[PDB]
């Protein structure tokens, strides 16, 4: 496996994790929607029953399908909504500050409620 | 209660927690071994059956009893051993960096093994 020892709490927060979710995804090489390229924007593998080419984003929630070899993920989600406060974040897990880490927990839980109400 | 939403994993890491452990402890006012004064060094309430005046330290393990109104906790533990890498740490939970947070987990688990072997 080769993965950290973090609980299910803030697992998705990890980059490797979001990338592991990607099983196949045709958009790999020669495309701006690669596993690591997309996961870096919050998008996590979540293909539907009929629409396998559907990549949704966590920490905000936003289903997006019909990608092409030239659709920046970070710009995609943000373009529709900046629900992901991590998009801008450019500091490794062990680089950012705790204060910023916890602050995220509030955002995630916040977005979840938005879905309902 | 008024306490964060952190799991049992790294609970003691919190200052308020280490302080909450202190039930009574005579050394409160007019002493250098107050609840907040000691907890700041890693010492957590842990009175024995016969020796209620015994304050041990976590993240290192070190039983110390027979305190007096002039025994710096941080200097006490360190004096005998610097098992607590947090002693020097002077940054609030949301102040320090993640890298330093995780690095601690290794120390704690390390000290635990030392006890056995
Ligand atoms: Zn997102
Ligand atoms: Zn200690």
């Amino acid at each position: 496996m080769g993965a950290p020892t973090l609980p299910p709490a803030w697992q998705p927060f990890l980059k490797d994790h979001r990338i592991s979710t990607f099983k196949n995804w045709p958009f790999l090489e020669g495309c701006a929607c690669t596993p690591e390229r997309m996961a870096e924007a919050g998008f996590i593998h979540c293909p539907t029953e009929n629409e396998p080419d559907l990549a949704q984003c966590f920490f905000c929630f936003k289903e997006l399908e019909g990608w092409e070899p030239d659709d920046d993920p970070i710009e995609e989600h943000k373009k529709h909504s900046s629900g992901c406060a991590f998009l801008s974040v450019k500091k490794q897990f062990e680089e950012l500050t705790l204060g910023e880490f916890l602050k995220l927990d509030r955002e995630r839980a916040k977005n979840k409620i938005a879905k309902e109400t």
Side-chain angles (χ1 to χ4, degrees), chain A residues 24-40:
Chain A
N24 257 23
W25 199 249
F27 287 137
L28 285 129
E29 309 264 296
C31 305
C33 322
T34 85
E36 274 183 41
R37 173 68 49 198
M38 283 174 97
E40 163 58 31

Side-chain angles (χ1 to χ4, degrees), chain A residues 4-107:
Chain A
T5 42
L6 263 150
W10 332 279
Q11 240 240 100
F13 279 62
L14 309 197
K15 177 108 136 33
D16 68 280
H17 175 88
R18 282 174 270 196
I19 267 103
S20 193
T21 357
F22 290 118
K23 222 80 255 134
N24 257 23
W25 199 249
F27 287 137
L28 285 129
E29 309 264 296
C31 305
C33 322
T34 85
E36 274 183 41
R37 173 68 49 198
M38 283 174 97
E40 163 58 31
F43 292 119
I44 289 173
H45 206 222
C46 209
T48 354
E49 221 162 54
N50 292 5
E51 311 317 316
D53 224 45
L54 208 196
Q56 69 172 230
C57 191
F58 101 117
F59 206 84
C60 61
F61 315 105
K62 229 282 173 271
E63 288 155 44
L64 287 140
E65 140 178 14
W67 294 77
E68 277 147 10
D70 252 24
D71 272 283
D72 288 8
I74 256 175
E75 232 236 294
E76 188 64 85
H77 172 198
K78 217 208 310 199
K79 150 158 298 198
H80 288 263
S81 247
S82 218
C84 271
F86 103 99
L87 307 171
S88 254
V89 137
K90 274 180 110 88
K91 352 76 123 75
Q92 300 274 77
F93 197 108
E94 289 107 318
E95 249 215 295
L96 41 52
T97 350
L98 251 302
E100 185 119 44
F101 176 48
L102 274 291
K103 230 192 115 74
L104 298 218
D105 267 274
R106 247 70 196 283
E107 306 273 299

